[PDB]
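Q: What would this complex look like in 3D?
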Amino acid sequence: MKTADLCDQFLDELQVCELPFQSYGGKRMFSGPIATVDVFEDNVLVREALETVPPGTVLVVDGKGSRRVALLGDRLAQIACERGLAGVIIHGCIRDSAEIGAMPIGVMAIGTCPVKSKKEGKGARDVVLEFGGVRWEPGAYVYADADGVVVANKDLLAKNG
Amino acid sequence: MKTADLCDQFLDELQVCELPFQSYGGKRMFSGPIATVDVFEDNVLVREALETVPPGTVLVVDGKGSRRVALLGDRLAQIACERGLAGVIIHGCIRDSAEIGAMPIGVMAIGTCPVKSKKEGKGARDVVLEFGGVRWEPGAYVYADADGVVVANKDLLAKNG
Amino acid sequence: MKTADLCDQFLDELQVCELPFQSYGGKRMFSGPIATVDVFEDNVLVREALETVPPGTVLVVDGKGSRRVALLGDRLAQIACERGLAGVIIHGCIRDSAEIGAMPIGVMAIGTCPVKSKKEGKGARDVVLEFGGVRWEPGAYVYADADGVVVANKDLLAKNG
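A: Here is my prediction, written as structure tokens for the whole assembly.
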């Protein structure tokens, strides 16, 4: 589960995120199949994804790194906990960081912003994301911890060759 | 008291600081009427302000974001505690961060620096400050927490319209 | 031992590091005689240094600030603990930060990276390093804590004039 160990064993099959994230959730280490959301200062699709993706999923949200609004708050983090998701990785900001820090889920983002995001529904789910020098594909697997975030095109702990 | 809630209710009457601060005090959430100090690597006026502003005040210090010296240390933070101030927000650095982290007051700054600031008394108090994309006016109200810092031109929790 | 106090008393004999470090070890405050290592994404010499420098030493490693690989992990940090070193300061990244945070040693670096460094042995030990606006010389003394890092050309707490 350590990204350090995964790199030592499978570096050739891994993409290493170049963007350093701040860890906000109660869980510092988390991993699972990737579900994607591509938005810009709007989180309606982030919410719909959290309410529908399979348990154990790690939702990756490309918010273009905007710091003008938060894309996830305690209400949405709560949904993630209630539906048994592994965590959320956001190329953007979150809010209610105090409350999220007390939840048993992983949450990584580049910063905090108290302003709510737009609620128009613009953006798309299940598309290929591109940020942090990494190509995030639906169905791929992401592993995150205190040292970083790495992505594999399949479950590296269920393979045999 | 949450900046997230204040933005949802009063965004149109609020200024949202664009500069992310590091939180150093024992209190992560604090708010109150603003008192201003405008200086450059000198903290004599910061000290005089802390020794004279009314209880509950949040001292906002524009140190131009300099990282060459600290503008507040444990002695001054102690004064802030003894006189019942709400906290201090500094566009600059502080020192004695270890000691300040144990004090029941809010302290936000952009970094730490072990070097003491000049003691010449240059600068001015009670002037309008301009940094972080925000206009900080004396008498205005500031609310700070783990998600950010927002400024209103009056007490938003004592108003009725 | 506080960098703030050292600056107040000996600023004229001190070099103040301009590069802000993240603190990863169980010890937030540490100091001692400097041992140097100059490398670039390779840590064989970092390991050899940790296995040979005198107890109480603070190993300073100039990794050119690279964020592509880690230069120190839990194995090497463990060696530092077993041989009684004071700490390590790295102009580069580390990994196994979770594990290192539980160790009684000082560790400062600019970030984390899960990828292992090269093991070719390129680089040099006991040379003068130059980074963070500071000239790091073998035999010099370094003092580090929550506020910063300062370097003196001799033990400032064993001198008399």
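A: To summarize the key features: Residues 1-161 of chain C form a domain with the Glucose Oxidase; domain 1 fold (CATH 3.50.30.40). DSSP finds four helices and eleven strands in chain C.
Q: Very helpful, thank you.
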